[PDB]
Every structure is written in C-alpha cells, then in structure tokens.
Amino acid sequence: XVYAF
Amino acid sequence: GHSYEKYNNWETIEAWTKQVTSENPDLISRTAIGTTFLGNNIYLLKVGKPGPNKPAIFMDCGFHAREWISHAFCQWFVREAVLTYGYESHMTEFLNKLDFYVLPVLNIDGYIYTWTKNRMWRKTRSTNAGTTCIGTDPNRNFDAGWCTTGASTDPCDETYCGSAAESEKETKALADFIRNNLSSIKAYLTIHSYSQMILYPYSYDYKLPENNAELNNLAKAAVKELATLYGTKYTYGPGATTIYPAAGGSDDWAYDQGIKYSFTFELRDKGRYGFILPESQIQATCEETMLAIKYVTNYVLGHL
Ligand SMILES: [Zn+2]
C-alpha cells in the first residue's frame, strides 16, 4: 500500500 | 448506526465489538490485547464454539489507517461466521474445531485520523524525538530484518520504521499476544489494500521460506477460489519479488516465530479507486475474500 506502488 | 455495507468510524466499531459479542456469547468473546499511543483499546474477538485446547487462526485488519476496506472485512467476517454457523457445514466445522482470533482494527489512532483530519493517513499517531513529524509504519516496526530495506529512518516518511522494533504500543501488543499464544496459533493472516494480492514471506530479504512450495500452492489455490465468484484476479508470491522488498513486517515476523502459514492479503482494487473504494463494492469484495479465507482455514485444519 505504499505510494505509489 | 453500524452497517456491514458501509465504512464505520471507530466509535461505531468499538460499540459493535461489544454488541456483536453480547448478541452471540455462544460464539464470541472479547478482550483487549493492549492500548494505543492515544489510549484506545485494541480489541480482539475470539470467534468459535468454546472448548479445551483448540488450535487457532489469527487475523487482523487495519494495520494501515487509509485502507478502509480492510477494517470492513474483519467486521464482515465476524458476522458471516455467526450467521452461517449451524447453517453452512464448513463454517460450522471451522468454529467447532478451531478458534478465529479476529483483531478488527490494530491501528485505531491512525484510523480515527483518517476520519477526522486526513483521509490518506497510513501510520500510527505517535510522536517522534527531534521532529514534529508523526507516526510509525506499523508494518515496518516488527523484529524482522528490522529497518534494513524498503523502510525509512525518516519519521516524516510514510514507511518510517520507528525508533526501534516494537517501539509502538500497538505492534508490541500484537507481538506480545502472538508470543504468548504461539502453541495454539497455526496461521497468521493480515488484511490490507490495495493491489489484489496474496503475499507470503519473505519481504525483508530475497531468501525463501523452507515451505516455500507449500505456501505458493496454497496461495495459488486460494486465489482460484476467490476468483470463482466474480472473476476478480489476484496475483501471488513472496512479498519481496511480488511487490517489493520491505523489512519489519508482521507476516515475516510471525512466520519466523514458527507460524508456518503466514499471508498478507491485499484486497480491491487495482488502482481505479485505490484506498477510496466505494461502499457499493464492500459486499462483493468481502464475499469473494471470504472464499479465500475459508479455503486457507480448511487447509490449516487438515494440516495440524
Ligand atoms: Zn497496507
């Protein structure tokens, strides 16, 4: 859920 | 009031944990495993038909504040369990033979913040020395190759790893509970969004778990079961190569404690709506996700 992966 | 078909604020979820337990004392008991930085109670619901020395499966939701569909699912799961017990033979077998530890919201402080101030907030709401930047990434704060890759040492970053492993009350609480109950917990399932993936260790290193083949086959079959309902396509694999290297995650940590079945679920969608998944998709998302969870539960059961 890390932006923007 | 509470709805399984809408996103609920923390006040409503907390009231719900007491209510659903009150209505189904035969199938649910409630405790807290700890308190948050801001003093909120980290509730854990024990779902199952009570009995001596039963194995368990542990599931949490709401590690990351903005991933609202995650919180939604834990609530959905609890209702489905109590509705279909005695009516659907598999769920009935599950609750008779094992318990589900369902932790509806781990990161309560951050979740409240997404409701009151900043919808895109991710981390906890703890303070940091030497800066006004707030919060640690709970899924970078476990003792698993801690802070060695895919994490930030900068408190101002959304992947900040914390001042030390288990520096956060919420993470230390979760880890304390699993340590204390290691002899019964047979699987660990942590629910996130978004990406539509099923991930297993390792993320903190490129190395593979010794039962890598088993985990891959189990994840593969669960993805198939999930797709049977609406054709929703999930991808699967070791976290490091499947989405990115990232240290300090709870799935890796749980696996390294000896819990052989450890999965991160990333729910809908693939980016059209991202974290802001419309409430109209809550039901379908949850229904298809239930199929994967129950498939894993059945598997664990026959591999005790
Ligand atoms: Zn997440």
Residue numbers in the entry:
A (entry chain F): 2 to 6
B (entry chain A): 6 to 188, 188A, 189 to 308
From the study:
The carboxypeptidase TAFIa (activated thrombin activatable fibrinolysis inhibitor) is a central player in fibrinolysis. TAFIa removes carboxy-terminal lysines and arginines from partially degraded fibrin. Carboxypeptidase B (CPB) was used instead of TAFIa for practical reasons, since TAFIa was found to be highly unstable with a half-life of approximately 2h at 22 °C30. CPB, on the other hand, is stable and highly homologous to TAFIa with 48% sequence identity.
The known anabaenopeptins B, C, and F (1, 2 and 3) were isolated from a culture of the cyanobacterium Planktothrix rubescens and tested for their inhibitory activity against TAFIa in an enzymatic assay. Compounds 1–3 turned out to be potent inhibitors of TAFIa with IC50 values of 1.5, 1.9 and 1.5 nM, respectively. After soaking, the crystals diffracted to 2.0–2.3 Å, enabling the calculation of detailed and accurate electron density maps. The linear part of the anabaenopeptins, which mimics the carboxy-terminus of the TAFIa substrate fibrin, deeply penetrated the active site channel and bound in the carboxylate- and specificity-pockets, while the circular parts of the anabaenopeptins were positioned in the entrance of the channel and completely blocked the channel like a plug, thereby preventing other molecules from entering it. All hydrogen bond donor and acceptor atoms of 2 interacted either with hydrogen bond donor/acceptors from the protein, or with bound water molecules. We found that the C-terminal arginine or lysine side chain (R1 in Fig. 3) bound in the S1’ binding pocket and interacted with the side chains of Asp255 and Ser207.
